[PDB]
Design a protein around this ligand. Structure first.
Ligand SMILES: [Mg+2]
Ligand SMILES: [Mg+2]
Ligand SMILES: [Mg+2]
Ligand SMILES: [Mg+2]
Lengths: 505, 505, 505, 505
């Protein structure tokens, strides 16, 4: 009952499967580090070069808070390779339902510097402060899959990332610092003001978040039938062809259709070193450019096209106890460049940019083909590494919001849970007792999935492991103890991709 | 109780503020004028020149009815400069809830012509007819902000505008009158058939209209965070850049995004005198061209661009008792040309037209960028002069309807209230007792607004008056008794613009 | 019951006396005139000369509203010469308790211009708007005794004065109009917005106002005993004299006192034509000077000193039906200059400015002697022409507020009652049916007075009429029908002055 | 339940706003330092030079106690820049209602000296003693805004200031120590005698203080109307001018007034280095001079006058964890000299010292103009940095007590809360285990404010942030983590000043 000697919680990483629900528990050992001597620091990049290949080319401004926060949003955190596979094979679609988070077994550790080395001792009376931003008072970090994430493997040690945000930024002018970027719209947030539980070793903390019924689904189903061949093949139609003429038997493409595939925006890949951002498809927003790559999903037969396919880095191996990743770029040699192939969009999605009449009875490739009524398409295939949910920035209006990168749409998402070491001052100016805290977090997510059944007589496709992945230690720990997960660059292995199960219609 | 000696209503122009609701009362003294000797008159413009700079260049046909109608739809009518400011500072968003309208203290005045001048006497037994088109039997005039509007200032005398409408119009052919424009689709409406209360001096009239819960909101919130910088700045992401490469720290523009800004249609401004309408962006509809200017809102740093920003005239001063405005063009020298700047869209809206891959690894400016899934944008900033609600013409299908001009979407709007002087004939052919009626209208609108609170630690922006506006008599009556309201041409003063309050996310 | 044929109220001007209460009814026939074509007009004086003898030498800015208001605040309105005398003789002190106001028998009269002359006809359906500013929403005109007042005599016809106010004024700069005077603090008030009863001939209007128990008293008592001789004359005192020495018998002035008289500010009178305002005692406030004349009351034997005694104009005669007085200066030859003698302060108030030690055992005249603890004084004698109550401008702090001019202090005063003719438009721009309204107002004020009894054996002083006043038609109507009231310039007749009755201690 | 492992309280810094009440929570991490080896020490300054520019020029004597105390009295501690702004815009006036104080999460830390450096370890059984002086047994430190204050920013670490006081002091004589200053009136207070809770890590401490209904208000309202122009501008008055003559239209300054502005004491600024204190306006008290600067508030157009305007230092930046400030003068280069402009007193307060009749019909400037009856004035504008309440020293009599420096009057204020580390002796003479304690304090203050509404039709003034303040990190933490708050010397930014909202009358 709060004594330093009884444990405040238990470690559970097991997944329980219901008929249409999954409960996944992610328990991690988390290291909370004092951030910037417990100081909010104004941070920004004045330079607004907007050129590819160079860091700090986008002007931005904001504050790094002393607080650390929990980022569990990704699929690989909550699903083992085994459970993900079951999910891929078993469910047409799934969505998160609730997330329960426990923080317990809190240890504030004092680091003491001695000649031999650092000495670690428990600070029994030391507290950590924890508050959950249910209200959305503080800026949400909505960008998916940063290094802020928990490890996929239970045994990985999690260092809560330092909470920082960007605020309203002016277009930079010459010979001026970051403050110049700040304006009357710019917002400084002091997390410290918010009521936050102060926790000692005896204490436990939990919050609960429930997703609204309007939460988006992640779809594992692929169409069996081509959308352009929906006809009975044995019968002619009264309908004319595209050109206006008789619709010949077995020439469904020529025939007019009651529907069309989703919108296609022409996309390009640029290899020019230090090219201007506006070289790539996108648009200027504020003082900085925003790109639309990859854009609306289109089926691409080709294995390696950056613009068309979802592309992201995956760790080659994942070390069990990596240091705090604040301000550290992922090493290129430590990551695979993985592209998610859209060949699973073969039945529904358009392969290439649309041709429409340009002039004089000619059709031109459509650089931007927006949504027109009667358009039907499938989403980009989701992946294991994709966020669970994607929260779009609040705006007046959005159109059929889907993240190309991944995640399922949510009217609202779990608010950030902020954890910070309570500063223990030494009684001397600018000096604090050097302390970090370790605790165990348990993220328990309830899931909903729709079971998928096959009505086709013939054998159907299941996703199975392969020898090359096993011999790559995929979903295993290698000889060095590192957790491999994705084993290869290029086309992301079929295991981690959704849109597998076969829907009839 | 109906006697000519007791008043049938009271004058209230006060605004009452609830926690989340506002009740605004607009009381005006209205002059009802006999229209065209109580005759429905076929009116049309045969010429369909479709060229800028010349009146009657659009072919149209319809009828001017003897009836007059109430047009209270605009914000400046129902909100004083003081109340509008409170609304701008206090509320994130607002919408109309109900509108109650009273017509009372009716005076039918006989005008008698004598050598000295016109003599005015009360016609005690004279009636006015009033009916409200709740059913939508008669054509709705949906076009926002015509000279039909009530004055913003309570003391202004309101002359009900003559009700006229356009109907189905044929493309005009040479050597033919307006009748030729009429076709089998053309609709003549006789208001007189509808049951209408006949009212004497003793009588009072009221209707009530309640907006559906589906009514659109007018949004006063501005995003603090750039939508392209939503990431934690201190952390790298697993995500690749736009080009497919490593996403550098502090170069958010290069990074791929889980969302994109709203659609951008390239817009142009033409200064060519008497230029063809098709010169401007738009499309042909029926026999006449329809333009899409300003189009989807985009952030424009520049103060004066007609196509990009909402542009409308505001009165320089507003006289207290202007004559009936039927068939009178607003004098150019009596109006300011006001453009609503979109610089408040800096965080969310795209600054310029999108670039998408054209060919050979090149990106071209997109003349039309339609909505594609995952697009998020903010509406054009609303203004004090904007209509309260905008009712779109009935059609089978509409897409995310928003008026660039202004107003909030309504599944239905208050039906027109038609008021006409009952004709008093002299017993001689084509001769009527010359009479107008004055009455007091009270438009009581219940409003809903969402209170806005700031969670940012630092000081936030409020909209305040400035010396230049005060010294322009803004929201005041000048030395001549005229009510100034908007004091300057060009960029419309920040007071009258919405999207002020700061939303966190 | 609201018909044009039954009267809506009765005329009562009688005063009813209770044991300690007086009810006074002031009924007047009021003419309500259309003001400035029903237009709020910005009005100001840019010139800030601040020199005596010239009009518009004080910079000010504000608006004249279309509204007219009721000003009944003065004693001569509510008390006949007979009742005032009874009050002066009977009561030590009095204060207003409640005020009830009826407006009834409303006639809207249309003025028609014909060759013979103006023709007057009743506009039966015409309304007047009346609202009482209980809330204090609109600026209070607190300045006592303007030409806005009702006549003292019941038969006088009252024209409601046009409501105008001054607002925050900037210090004027060269080559600029009144608008320049306006600033961000300046306040424009639209009376029209406020809910106001619209009244026809049948209608009656009433409000009630109750004074708080904290309302100030007007004091009719004079001290019999000199405050400096409070001792038993037959006995020596242990107390030393002022100089520190033995206090001789019958030399009370030499003796030290347990109290001192009220504060004395040296005052001067300047006869210099066009002298700077700062010549007179006072202080600069805002961009304009404010004078402190007459200042704290001091007893002055002399009959004619402007600075020391309350000085104001009284009408020589008062015509029964004077025209509207808006913007008309009182004619000098039509007024008596009346000074209220302070010789009644003989027992208590200090005759002249205090001497205090300057240096080297010398005493100098004190130009400003402020309040010091132990100071006791009597107020300046109140008069018949003095306001009933004086409302000071709202401020954070006030010190023992008393108006030298007159009136009794009130935490709050009856809010202005605004009456305006509802504009009747002709249907033509800037043209209204020419109309004024006449109605009968009844101001019923309940008073509280403390009965005064004499305990002195010998005969006491009563205030009686004199032959010279009777032969001046004082409190009478003269041969021409004019109501004389004050009959002489100089020392105001003893009849109209308070501080008569003799208090023992 | 008291174990070292469960936390004894939570951190809340949030502000909750009621309709007319505000609850502000100030939570700080406090460092309690052993003071002077737990010894009461007689402290005094024998020198009584009474000359400007040199420290210890005022003779004083007293004791520094081993105890530390809580000083939370200032506005910036309890209101974030955001909440202060809301308060400034929203409320006419406000006052503190209750203050609740929690002290919890107490850590006694032993400091151990080792060759490497100081080693910090928790002393589990160590106590701190806390007692609140509700009774007023010990001297109150009433002087506003010393370095004893908590930080305005939640994350700032608070070091409780050592409690010391001054007692009755004799005028010093040559060749004598501080003891000579002590006399029979001098009072030594031993805090140790008072019952005080001894607290270990498990323990929590709280007190509650409720302000009496007689507590003073801080006023945010400014008069719109000049007090010298309170008249209806369109009407002449019966009242004479200041000089005794006809009161001209639009020359309100010339007119006599029913009230006068508050008292003005002539004030001067002296630049003479090492000038005698008596050079400045003030008076001798005891053996030391007391100055009256700034004195009664007067409106000053000029931006920089020390005597007339409230003047105080504000930190340029505020470091998060400054060392104990006992006996440390604020560095001049670390502070802004801020003067609070009185230009907001334009409507009510007198601009300059009063002129009153000197002699021979001449008026002289009044060096001291004390309160005379009928004087009305506004207080000096309050500021964000001003104390919450100001407690005057107990005396027999006070007159309309207001602190020019700031704060609201209180019949009584929260008694000092004294916290001291329980001395842990080593068993050796004059040797104690070196220990300090850190704890978290929460100051929860309930506030009352009167909501302010505008009745003026035109736009009104709100206080908004400006770009220069944002680009100064006002209300933000700068790049170095320091909390800027006031960003400029000279005129204190309009954000932090009260008397904003516009009262009608
Ligand atoms: Mg066929
Ligand atoms: Mg990177
Ligand atoms: Mg004697
Ligand atoms: Mg005059």
């Amino acid at each position: 009952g709060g004594g330093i000697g009884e444990s405040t919680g238990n470690w559970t990483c097991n997944t329980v499967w219901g008929k249409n629900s999954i409960i996944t528990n992610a328990s991690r050992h988390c290291v909370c580090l004092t951030r910037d001597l417990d100081m909010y620091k104004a941070i920004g990049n004045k330079d607004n070069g907007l050129v590819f290949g160079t860091e700090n080319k986008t002007a931005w401004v904001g504050w790094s808070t002393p607080w650390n926060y929990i980022d569990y949003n990704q699929m690989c955190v909550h699903f083992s390779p085994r459970d993900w596979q079951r999910l891929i094979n078993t469910a047409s679609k799934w969505r998160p339902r609730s997330v329960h988070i426990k923080i317990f077994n809190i240890q504030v550790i004092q680091k003491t510097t001695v000649s031999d080395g650092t000495q670690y001792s428990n600070d029994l009376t030391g507290t950590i402060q924890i508050f959950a931003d249910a209200q959305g008072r503080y800026p949400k970090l909505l960008y998916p899959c940063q290094t802020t994430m928990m490890g996929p493997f239970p045994n990985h040690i999690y260092y809560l990332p330092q909470y920082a945000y960007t605020t309203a930024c002016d277009g930079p002018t010459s010979n001026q610092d970051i403050n110049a970027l700040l304006n009357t719209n710019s917002a400084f947030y002091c997390l410290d003001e918010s009521p936050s539980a102060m926790l000692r070793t005896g204490n436990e903390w939990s919050c609960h978040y429930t997703f609204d019924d309007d939460t988006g689904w992640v779809h594992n189903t692929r169409s069996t039938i081509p959308i352009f061949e929906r006809a009975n093949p044995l019968y002619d139609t009264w309908q004319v062809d595209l050109r206006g003429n008789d619709a010949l038997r077995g020439h469904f493409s020529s025939w007019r259709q009651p529907w069309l595939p989703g919108p296609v925006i022409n996309m390009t890949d640029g290899t020019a070193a230090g090219a201007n951002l506006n070289t790539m498809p996108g648009v200027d927003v504020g003082a900085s450019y925003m790109g639309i790559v990859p854009g609306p999903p289109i089926c691409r037969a080709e294995n390696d096209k950056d613009e068309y396919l979802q592309t992201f880095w995956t760790p080659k191996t994942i070390g069990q106890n990596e240091g705090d990743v604040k301000n550290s770029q992922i090493n290129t040699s430590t990551a695979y460049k993985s592209q998610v192939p859209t060949g699973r969009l073969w039945e529904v999605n358009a392969r290439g940019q649309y041709k429409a009449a340009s002039s004089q009875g000619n059709v031109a490739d459509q650089q931007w083909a927006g949504c027109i009524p009667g358009m039907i398409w499938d989403r980009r295939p989701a992946t294991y590494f994709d966020p669970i949910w994607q929260e779009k920035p609040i705006t007046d209006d959005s159109f059929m919001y889907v993240s190309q990168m991944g995640g399922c749409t949510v009217s609202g998402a779990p608010g950030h849970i902020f954890v910070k070491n309570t500063p223990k001052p030494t009684g001397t100016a600018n000096e604090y007792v050097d302390e970090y805290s370790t605790f165990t977090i348990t993220v328990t997510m309830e899931w909903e999935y729709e079971p998928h059944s096959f009505s086709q007589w013939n054998n159907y496709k299941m996703i199975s492991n392969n020898e090359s992945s096993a011999q790559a230690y995929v979903g295993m720990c290698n000889a060095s103890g590192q957790y491999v997960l994705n084993h290869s660059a290029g086309q992301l292995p079929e295991m981690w991709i959704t849109k597998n199960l076969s829907r009839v219609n």
